[PDB]
Design an enzyme around this catalytic site. Structure first.
Site, PDB file in Angstrom:
ATOM      1  N   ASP A  92       0.832  -1.193   0.000  1.00  0.00           N
ATOM      2  CA  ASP A  92       0.000   0.000   0.000  1.00  0.00           C
ATOM      3  C   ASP A  92       0.876   1.255   0.000  1.00  0.00           C
ATOM      4  O   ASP A  92       0.651   2.223   0.753  1.00  0.00           O
ATOM      5  CB  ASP A  92      -0.962  -0.052   1.196  1.00  0.00           C
ATOM      6  N   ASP A 145      -7.556  -4.726  10.619  1.00  0.00           N
ATOM      7  CA  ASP A 145      -7.154  -3.843   9.524  1.00  0.00           C
ATOM      8  C   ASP A 145      -7.193  -2.378   9.952  1.00  0.00           C
ATOM      9  O   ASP A 145      -6.529  -1.536   9.359  1.00  0.00           O
ATOM     10  CB  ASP A 145      -8.079  -4.018   8.317  1.00  0.00           C
TER      11      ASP A 145
END
Length: 361
Positions: free
Chosen positions: A136, A314
Site C-alpha cells: 500500500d 485492519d
C-alpha cells in the site's frame, strides 16, 4: 542467487508471533471442533510484519531460531517477512497511519529502520529470507495522486522502496514489491502505468535477480481464480488475481522486467462478501483461503502465500479514535474492531469457521 523459484526445497519458518496469538485465541474458543481447527492455523506459514521499528530486534530472534532449527534438523529454513514502515505510510487512508512522518525527519528514520533490519540479517546469514516490500505504497502513485498526503509522499515512497531493495538485495534477500490487487491496479487503464512504475523501481534498484517480482492481494480478499465471478467486480476484465497477473506480466516484460509473483490468499476463502471492491477494512464473514503452495496456476506465480495474518485487525471502527477511517465503519465491516495490527478474536473465529477449503482438527 537463483534463476528459479526461491521457495523451492525449503521448510517455511512458522511465525512464533502468530503461533502465540493463535494459541491464546484457541484457549478462548468454546466449541471444541472450532478450537481444534483454530489450532491447525499455527501450522500454516504466514509472513512476519515489521510494521514498527521496535520490532527490528525480533528479526534477529527469529533468524537465530530458524538458524538453530536448521542446524539441529539439517532442514533448510525460509523466513517470510514484510517491510512496512515508510514515512507518511498508507497515504490514502488513516487506518495504518504509521510512526514516521515526513514533517519530522521521516526519510532518515526510515533508512535507519531498514539498516536495523539489515544488521539483524547480517547477524544470521545462513537462513533464506523472502521479504514483501511496503504494501500500500507505490500502488497509491498510480491512482491516488489526488490525495494531498500521497502527492507529498511520492518521492519518499520511491526513494524508500529503492533503498530497501538495494540493502536487502546486497544481503541476498528475495524481495517481492507490493503491487496492489486486481480491483486496484487490474483495471485496464491502470495496467500500463503500473508496469511502467514498477519496472522503473526495478531499474533504479539495480535490476538484482534478488528483486524477484511483485506481491498481490496483500491484506485483501480477491479470489486467485474465480470459479464464479463476484458481482463487486463488474466492469473489470481482471476480476481475480490470476487475470490481473496474466494481464500485467507481459507488460512488465516489455518494460524490461520478467517479474515473478506471490499472491496472498489468507482471507480469500469466502467470496461475494463486499458491497464495493474498495471496501478492505475487516470485511465481515471472511474465511481463511487457499493454503500456501508452490503448485500455482501460472508460470509467473512462484507461490500462493498468507501475507496478512488472519485475526489481526485492519483498522479501528471507533469513530472517536485518531486512526479511524470511514472504510472501517462500513456496513460490511466486522464491528466493533480494535486498532490495526492488534488481535481481533471475533474475526478470527469467523475466519476459522468460514475456512475454504475447511480446516481439519
Amino acid at each position: 542467487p537463483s534463476t528459479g523459484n526461491p521457495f523451492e526445497g525449503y521448510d517455511i519458518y512458522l511465525s512464533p508471533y502468530y503461533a502465540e496469538e493463535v494459541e491464546a485465541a484457541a484457549a478462548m474458543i468454546d466449541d471444541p471442533v472450532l478450537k481444534a481447527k483454530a489450532l491447525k492455523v499455527k501450522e500454516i506459514p504466514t509472513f512476519i510484519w515489521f510494521d514498527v521499528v521496535r520490532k527490528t530486534p525480533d528479526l534477529g530472534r527469529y533468524l537465530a531460531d530458524a538458524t538453530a532449527i536448521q542446524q539441529r534438523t539439517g532442514r533448510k529454513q525460509l523466513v517470510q517477512i514484510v517491510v512496512y514502515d515508510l514515512p507518511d505510510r498508507a497515504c490514502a487512508a488513516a487506518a495504518s497511519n504509521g510512526e514516521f512522518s515526513l514533517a519530522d525527519g521521516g526519510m532518515e528514520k526510515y533508512k535507519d529502520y531498514v539498516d536495523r533490519l539489515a544488521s539483524e540479517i547480517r547477524k544470521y546469514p545462513d537462513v533464506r529470507i523472502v521479504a514483501v516490500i511496503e504494501p500500500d505504497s507505490l500502488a497509491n502513485m498510480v491512482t491516488n495522486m489526488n490525495v494531498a498526503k500521497c502527492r507529498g509522499a511520492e518521492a519518499a515512497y520511491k526513494e524508500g522502496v529503492i533503498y530497501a531493495l538495494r540493502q536487502l538485495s546486497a544481503l541476498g534477500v528475495y524481495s517481492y514489491v507490493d503491487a496492489g490487487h486486481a480491483g486496484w491496479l487490474g483495471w485496464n487503464a491502470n495496467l500500463a502505468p503500473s508496469a511502467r512504475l514498477f519496472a522503473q523501481i526495478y531499474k533504479d534498484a539495480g535490476r538484482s535477480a534478488f528483486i524477484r517480482g511483485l506481491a498481490t492481494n496483500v491484506s485483501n480478499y480477491n479470489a486467485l481464480s474465480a470459479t464464479t465471478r463476484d458481482p463487486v467486480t463488474q466492469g473489470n476484465d481482471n476480476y481475480d488475481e490470476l487475470r490481473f497477473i496474466n494481464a500485467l506480466a507481459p507488460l512488465l516484460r516489455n518494460e524490461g522486467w520478467d517479474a515473478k509473483f506471490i499472491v496472498d490468499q489468507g482471507r480469500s476463502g469466502v467470496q461475494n462478501i463486499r458491497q464495493e471492491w474498495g471496501n478492505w477494512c475487516n470485511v465481515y464473514g471472511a474465511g481463511f483461503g487457499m493454503r500456501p503452495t508452490l503448485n500455482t496456476p501460472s508460470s509467473a506465480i512462484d507461490a500462493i502465500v498468507w501475507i496478512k495474518p488472519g485475526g489481526e485487525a485492519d483498522g479501528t471502527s471507533d469513530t472517536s479514535a485518531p486512526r479511524y477511517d470511514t472504510h472501517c465503519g462500513k456496513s460490511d465491516s466486522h464491528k466493533p474492531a480494535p486498532e490495526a495490527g492488534t488481535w481481533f478474536q471475533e474475526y478470527f473465529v469467523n475466519l476459522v469457521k468460514n475456512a475454504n477449503p475447511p480446516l481439519a482438527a
